[PDB]
Design a protein around this ligand. Structure first.
Ligand SMILES: [Mn+2]
Ligand SMILES: [Mn+2]
Length: 401
């Protein structure tokens, strides 16, 4: 029915604490007071007239978004969607958006990896791990802060980030690449189950000299693929094109992705890439899936409400460009994968409902859809292209056509 469907994930753009929010926490504080869009709106303001026109301010909430009025003549269909999976991480949310139910949520490690994991890597490698570096850390600061020490002692530098990732930095002159990879493979093999379930292990070789290090191209990644076919696989198996923009290919480890358009330098460069992709003469039928990550990486995790607002405003300003590039029989879906309330305690994601905005020039109606679940997105897409659903989700295609 829609010849193309373009799904855009505004990473972390939540619309209020989920019913099961208090099963999740932020530096010990349960997530049940979180509200990414509402707390932004109430503190720093929020001017998003293009999303409002589609209907962002018509999405049901107990208390309305302070600065996003209801729209009595909306141009699209909107609602909010509830996460079923037992995790609030990026991989879980995207996998569920594409139809999986994740009941073994990836572990994150705000206070570093536990002794069982470190002790094991030390015994396997014969190298000590620098304990002070075993915690969240920018890849760059960690190489600068502990590399000098590493060059002298041969110790491993094992660090993480807000994501379920284990990264091993090792200078090529003192830790041979082959050993780094063996160490990473061993690491990957002992992190397949909770409480050490990791999305990916990254080898981070690097060369150079103190106060001036370079991270080399000898990087290798050891990622988990989705454990069951997702709707991306269903589409690809049926010969339907699947175009990925931004973090999408990494998140799915390329599974069911026919055309990876690569990483975003920024949200704006991402929107440029989506627009270009929509304009390809080759792209006549199928699915595009874009992640715009800056909301999460730059603003949510850093608890910066002012910046989060500006990033939302900048996306809204560009939204008319995305729409101008649509064909009449295209569908645009805008959503998120969890919350990351910049006003909250902690520095993690927040367990929230996510907005759903739906727009096509072909629409003969508009309004508000019943509240749903993340994987309803996948099922709608499957329904549209005549392929099977994955684990979960129910189509709302008939409310759109
Ligand atoms: Mn995310
Ligand atoms: Mn995040």
């Amino acid at each position: 029915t829609f010849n193309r469907i373009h799904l855009v994930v505004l990473d972390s753009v939540g619309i209020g604490a989920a019913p099961d929010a208090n099963n999740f926490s932020n530096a010990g504080v349960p997530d049940g007071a979180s509200d990414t869009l509402g707390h932004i709106s109430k503190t720093v303001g929020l001017n998003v007239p293009n999303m409002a026109k589609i209907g962002l301010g018509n999405i049901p909430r107990d208390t309305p978004l302070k600065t996003v009025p209801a729209e009595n003549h909306p141009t699209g269909y909107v609602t909010k969607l509830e996460e079923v999976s037992l995790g609030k991480d990026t991989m879980t949310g995207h996998w569920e958006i594409m139809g999986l139910n994740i009941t073994e949520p990836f572990d994150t490690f705000w206070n570093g990896f536990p002794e069982e994991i470190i002790s094991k890597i030390e015994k396997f490698s014969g190298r000590k791990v620098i304990r002070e570096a075993n915690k969240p850390y920018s890849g760059t600061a960690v190489i600068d802060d502990f590399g000098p020490r590493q060059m002298e002692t041969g110790e491993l530098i094992i660090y993480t980030s807000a994501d379920p990732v284990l990264q091993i930095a090792a200078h090529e002159d003192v830790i041979p690449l082959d050993e780094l990879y063996r160490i990473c493979e061993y690491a990957r093999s002992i992190t397949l189950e909770r409480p050490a379930l990791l999305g990916r292990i990254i080898a981070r070789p690097y060369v150079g000299k103190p106060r001036n290090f370079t991270r080399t191209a000898n990087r290798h990644d050891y990622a988990l693929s989705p454990f069951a076919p997702t709707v991306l696989n269903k589409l690809a198996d049926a010969g339907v094109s699947t175009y990925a923009v931004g973090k999408i290919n990494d998140i799915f480890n390329g599974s069911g992705i026919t055309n990876d358009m690569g990483h975003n330098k920024s949200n704006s460069h991402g929107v440029d890439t989506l627009i270009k992709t929509m304009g390809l003469s080759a792209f006549t039928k199928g699915f595009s899936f874009t992640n715009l990550v800056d909301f999460d990486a730059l603003y949510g995790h850093r608890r910066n409400a002012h910046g989060y607002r500006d990033c939302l405003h900048e996306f809204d300003e560009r939204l008319p460009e995305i729409i101008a590039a649509m064909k009449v029989d295209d569908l645009l879906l805008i959503t998120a994968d969890h919350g990351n309330d910049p006003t909250y305690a902690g520095t993690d994601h927040t367990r929230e409902y996510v907005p759903l905005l739906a727009y096509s020039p072909s629409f003969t109606g508009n309004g508000v859809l019943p509240v749903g679940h993340y994987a309803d997105i996948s099922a709608t897409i499957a329904d549209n292209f005549g392929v099977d659903t994955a684990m979960i989700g129910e189509s709302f295609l008939d409310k759109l056509i």
